[model samples]
Target: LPLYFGWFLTKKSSETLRKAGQVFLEELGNHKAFKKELRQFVPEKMDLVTYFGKRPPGVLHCTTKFCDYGKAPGAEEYAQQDVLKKSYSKAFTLTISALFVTPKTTGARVELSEQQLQLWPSDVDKLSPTDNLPRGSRAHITLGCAADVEAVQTGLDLLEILRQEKGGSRGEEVGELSRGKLYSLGNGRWMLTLAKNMEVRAIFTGYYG
Candidate 1:
């Protein structure tokens, strides 16, 4: 009965958004229980979380969050309104809120796989094109301390690339670089320093648009 749930977002492309929306509708259409649940829940606009109790496939839960872009330094100088628009790509963090529903000693448990985690983003790309979604669209989810740390560092590294290009004013650089700027909050909890104004969303079900 224990479930894994989270949200993810890609660039704000109509192609990406439309493909994601189509995926959601397809997933709900195929699963009667999900359709029933969706009707009961009646979500207006939100991120949906899904879970596979035993592994492969299962039920999903949908919800929304007040999503916004995380700020980065030297944003104004870059003239980039949203980080996703400026950067070559975008990444996201998966925060496990809670095991919403769990059956006592009877419900199945799902384990996160390192291999699957590694393949997640690429898989999204494949799915995207098939659904008429954008090609080269990327997405990844990092969980636990090690994964979280890696994600944070990776994000910072990307930001630094931008900083180096825009930090200086004509003759001098203004911002300082922190190599290990990323930190952990103990017990496998970590936060990422993402590019400014990056928007993200999570899809609970699988589809090709």
Candidate 2:
């Protein structure tokens, strides 16, 4: 778990998101239309608990760079950046603009501000070089995953949804729950834009396991 640079959600913020995530899942499970739409992604007989079967394993965080404990290319340099050093352990407010789920994972979409974006790696977009999405499009906090799915897949799934959106494949409106507008990004991908953005306190730091 000593993996990367990230922003760990404050205790209160983590609890807030956990509670909201549960309610969000519960509301999705109870909605008849959403359940029907979700059929393509989940087994027809499965419930939310069985669908999102793997809960996140540690303190909730928005991963900035996945370093694989200094094994990844550019990790050492990235870790040594002055900006990274200066911001380390600093507190900031992050906004969760939306919550999304795919057949593989569920996560919160973190909308980073200009200042917050400075600490994000410039080469992150290279992870999907074929696409032209804006940098930081992959920023998210993994909530849960389907059985056997890795938490790292959360960001990749979010990128897929963003790719679809940028290509003008906008999601179909499902309904409003938790005062948020729900959209079906085709197949099993679903996104909900919160009516009021969720602001949470976070500390920028390295997770050394």
Candidate 3:
């Protein structure tokens, strides 16, 4: 199953309404499609000074670092480290600039929680450390786009039915299944992971496409 992980860096500046604009311009500039799409929103200016002049006033800068993976090793550590490093590098450079430039709201720290630092998998051993995979437990089934809330509810319903059919009472041997977990990208998209193997299959509507 495929998996995806990411980190985010949010920057706020009173003096510089949109400071991180340069970072996106640097990262996505290579792709013509991305440039064409963003050009509609990001005004083109002859220089940096002019670019800031054209944007809406009071538009604070914000950024989110992200990446995707199709397999292990790629999903496990490499992709995780890359996103973390990118986020930290961007934040560190901005912090140094703030120290010298004294940009307003300067030195505001970028914080990553334990989950964020772990790359969103929550550790395999932690999921099932014992001999048996505990009922109502969760493991990273796969990574994909955010799960539709309705679809996740449907999976929850199916879990209840499975529990009953397995000669176990609902809410008895197996506790209630959790709603599919969705990690927001702060952009429109999200990274979703699930616990149930069968539900994961059903949520996508098939095992393979």
**Of the candidates shown, which would achieve the greatest lDDT relative to the real structure?**
2
Q: For residues 20-118, what per-residue lDDT tens digits would candidate 1 score against the true structure?
A: 323433333344343333434332322232221122122221211111121323322222323223322333333321111111000101122342243
What are the models' TM-scores? 0.18, 0.94, 0.18
User: Could you tell which candidate, 1 or 2, scores higher by lDDT?
Assistant: 2
Model 3, position 91: C-alpha lDDT score = 29
What are the per-residue Cα lDDT tens digits for candidate 2 across 1-209? Answer: 24888999988899899778877887877776677766587655447656788986546999998788898887898888888889989999999999987889988999999989988886665346577888789999988898889988999899888888898999988789894998888788888899999999999998876
C-alpha root-mean-square deviation, each candidate: 21.3, 1.7, 21.7
Colliding residue pairs in candidate 2:
none
Root-mean-square deviation of candidate 3: 21.7
Q: How many backbone clashes can be found in candidate 2? A: 0
Q: Which ranges in model 2 have alpha carbons more than 4 Å from their true place?
A: 43-45
Pairs of residues at least 3 apart in sequence or in different chains that clash in candidate 3:
none
**Lowest summed lDDT window (length 10), candidate 3:** 96-105
